[PDB]
């Protein structure tokens with residue numbers, strides 16, 4: 001149900017050139033997970049009923065950066081600012097979603113389709129829309145389903161984003177990577193989730209909540225068994241996430 | 250542009266009986282200003298663009314009561330609870346707006362028309378929509394105009410609500426009454442505003458902002474000169490305020 005806006009040939013050229021620059025920068029700086037988090041925290045605030053929040057560049061606002069969920073994202077914003085300044089024609093909205101897409105690609109994940117044209121909006125959403133790591137399945141459906149408008153399948157596939165990166169006791173309070181290979185986009189998140197606790201690896205209560213749900217569980221199993229199927233469903237869910245409220249939501 | 254809902258004859262009877270009980274209670278307890286504040290803080294959170302907030306009973310929620318603007322309104326809620334329990338058929342939305350209307354009447358103000366039928370909504374608006382006492386005319390238009398959808402005239406007339414009651418250093422930090430007669434609804438707020446500072450009387454920066462604005466000032470002058478005109482415009486503005494998002498906003 002999307003109708004994507006026309007952007008100029010110059011705009012498209014800058015997308016292509018920014019995409020390449022983002023690859024080099026993110027790979028060199030080893031900051032793919034942080035950039036994926038930046039894109040997800042930008043998009044994940046969308047509320048379908050009121051058409052507020054979502055991926056519209058507001059994550060750069062000091063006010064949204066002050067949200068406790070967004071601990072450490074000021075680093076992400078700061079890291080990208082010099083690069084963004086090379087592409088003044090692009091919206092921050094687009095640039096940050098493009099960073100997220102590139103973060104997934106340079107760690108070896110699926111190629112998430114990208115459509116330009118998000119406008120930078122003046123008002124950040126209110127604080128408190130991002131999911132709570134201590135809650136379970138009901139909460140996840142409230143946030144991803146009732147607010148964002150994504151599916152149960154999208155919830156499980158997107159949770160797989162934890163295949164890269166780590167928690168930090170100074171940010172959330174949780175600590176350590178979900179996987180043994182936290183700069184590699186693979187289905188290891190689901191394998192580790194299933195096998196139970198292992199020394200040095202993290203599971204949030206929100207990850208554990210996927211195991212006990214009658215709908216989430218079969219998807220955890222599917223993705224653990226079949227990384228191709230994970231990649232397919234992940235690319236679908238990330239695209240929808242990155243486009244919430246955009247070109248029709 | 251309002252279309253008021255049908256309510257049962259039993260509902261209407263309870264409105265009439267609650268109105269009378271509210272008169273006696275508010276007069277005896279000397280709590281008209283607090284009740285007017287309770288009604289205004291309930292209604293004043295309406296945002297026209299998203300149709301969120303407004304007079305829908307959510308002021309009783311511990312979460313909205315925790316808003317710093319709402320210091321001392323937990324007392325107001327507590328005071329009315331026994332009375333409300335005598336009228337289980339009425340929405341809190343209606344009961345609190347009716348308290349506001351009665352607060353104005355029992356202190357000798359205009360008779361603000363009242364239409365029943367507000368539904369109690371599950372979600373409080375986000376914090377931060379109520380006006381800031383330290384700001385001026387631009388802010389007042391942002392809040393009353395851009396968010397609530399009221400007029401410049403409504404801003405000045407409603408500011409006249411400060412004709413009753415007082416600030417408290419333990420609540421806002423401001424202190425004392427606007428008028429020499431703070432349980433009497435009259436045009437004294439505008440008279441005192443115009444004559445400048447007087448010992449024992451309060452003026453907020455937001456009240457003072459009415460004096461310097463080219464549109465607000467002539468209305469301050471009109472109301473100071475003519476309490477009948479104040480009463481007419483006040484009754485209009487309060488009615489619109491009490492009905493924001495209700496029966497069409």
Ligand code: HEM
Pocket residue numbers: 032033034036037040072131132133134140158159160161162164165166167168169171172173174204206
């Ligand atoms: C399902 C609900 C989710 C919860 C409760 C949640 C919660 C968290 C928490 C608590 C952290 C640790 C932050 C820190 O301490 O540094 C984190 C990190 C992370 N999240 Fe999630 N998140 C969720 C969904 C997602 C989604 C949908 C994605 C992307 C598709 C994602 C991607 C990431 C990444 C890449 C990191 C690592 C950041 C880094 O390495 O600095 N998360 N998340």
Ligand code: HEM
Pocket residue numbers: 281282283285286289321380381382383389407408409410411413414415416417418420421422423453455
């Ligand atoms: C114009 C912007 C407004 C600002 C900045 C503002 C601000 C304030 C502040 C700071 C207080 C003192 C709270 C305390 O310390 O106890 C107060 C009290 C009060 N306000 Fe306003 N207010 C505004 C508009 C209104 C409106 C529209 C009404 C109703 C029509 C209203 C009715 C009242 C009443 C009756 C009190 C006294 C409460 C008491 O006696 O405990 N105000 N307001």
